[PDB]
């Protein structure tokens, strides 16, 4: 959250429409430890 | 053998599975990290069967 | 010798509307401007118990429910009191009290914060008049006055102490959850949906 | 815009997000672990 904003903003003219993207980060989600096998089964580790 | 036919003959006989104590520990540690993802959403109602389910399993000596 | 740097003697015939005064200081036009603590609120409207009691608020918040009746049962209120006779008059649940010392405190209640007056010069309380554009002078505020809580044991602070030590008890940000299938699954899948859509695009682009 | 998966944190032995700090006194002979261990370190590699 110290950085929670990228904002990119384009003033289209090829008709002036400013056009701002923006992405918001939210919560950070967690988990307990996982292994991922070559095979492509995952299980706790 | 292939992988997937160990990974089938492995769900087949833990289908199978009565009891092992290295299976029942790690259910107990999955059970216990859905609970705790339970109690982080605030889900009440979950996380009673959640530790009924535990109560049963557990009980060790 | 500073010349005054104004000699043109232009003069504005401003007249302004002053209303009567519901009272007048006597001796001396002091004032003692006094902050406001977090524990104690100022109603100014009179106190309607219906509204009140039904608009009290329930939050699953322990301390700021705490907080909140704290300050709602510490919150300087007044009424209309009708008098035995018949008439009406009005009746406040705050008052001051000056001790034997010489000290002040302020009382809601049962409860009693002392008053903590430190001399300021220079200080002057004006009224605003924005359709003309002018400040009117009122009085001199000669001192600052601080409200303290009179004792530990008081009530007052005890639920300001517990509010504040549990408030700093709940911090847990992070929400956890449980992975079921590989994490890198979705880039790779869509990597793969990408590069097809990528050569899809360049044979039609070379068949345009 | 979901939870997506920005990186994976290695996570201390015996600490509050490690597999071990249920598990009790029994089940932490099954897995192989020694009950003095005490934790506090890392396992990369």
Redesign the interface.
């Given at each position: 959250w110290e950085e929670p904003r990228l904002i990119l903003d384009q003033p289209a003219q090829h008709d002036n429409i400013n056009k701002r993207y923006e992405?918001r980060f939210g919560?950070?989600?967690?988990?307990?430890?996982?292994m991922?096998e070559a095979?492509?089964?995952?299980h706790?580790? | 053998l292939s992988?997937?036919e160990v990974?089938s003959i492995v769900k087949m006989k833990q289908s199978l599975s009565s009891n092992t104590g290295f299976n029942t520990v790690?259910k107990k540690?999955?059970l216990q990290?859905e609970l705790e993802e339970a109690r982080d959403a605030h889900d009440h109602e979950r996380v009673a069967r959640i530790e009924a389910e535990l109560k049963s399993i557990g009980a060790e000596s | 010798h500073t010349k005054s740097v104004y000699d043109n003697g232009e003069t504005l015939d401003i007249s302004l509307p002053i209303h009567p005064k519901s009272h007048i200081p006597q001796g001396k036009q002091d004032r003692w401007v006094v902050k406001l603590p977090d524990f104690l609120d100022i109603n100014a409207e009179p106190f309607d118990p219906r509204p009140f009691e039904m608009n009290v608020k329930t939050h699953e918040d322990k301390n700021q429910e705490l907080l909140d009746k704290l300050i709602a049962v510490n919150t300087v209120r007044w009424r209309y009191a009708k008098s035995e006779t018949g008439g009406i008059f009005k009746e406040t649940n705050s008052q001051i009290i000056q001790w034997e010392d010489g000290t002040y405190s302020l009382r809601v209640g049962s409860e009693i914060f002392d008053m903590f007056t430190t001399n300021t010069d220079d200080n002057y309380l004006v009224s605003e008049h924005n359709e003309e554009g002018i400040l009117m002078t009122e009085s001199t505020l000669s001192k600052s006055v601080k409200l303290v809580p009179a004792s530990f044991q008081s009530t007052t602070h005890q639920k300001l102490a517990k509010a504040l030590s549990a408030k700093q008890k709940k911090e847990s940000?992070?929400?956890?959850?449980?992975?079921?299938?590989?994490?890198?699954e979705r880039q790779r899948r869509l990597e793969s949906q990408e590069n097809e859509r990528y050569r899809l695009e360049r044979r039609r682009k070379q068949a345009e | 815009?979901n939870?997506v998966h920005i990186g994976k944190?290695p996570?201390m032995l015996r600490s509050k997000?490690?597999?071990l700090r249920t598990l009790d006194e029994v089940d932490l002979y099954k897995m192989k672990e020694c009950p003095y261990d005490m934790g506090g370190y890392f396992v990369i590699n």
């Open positions: 992405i919560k950070i989600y967690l988990s307990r430890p996982t991922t095979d492509g089964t995952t706790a580790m | 992988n997937d990974n790690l540690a999955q990290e | 940000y992070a929400r956890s959850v449980v992975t079921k299938e590989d994490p890198e | 815009g939870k944190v996570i997000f490690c597999s």
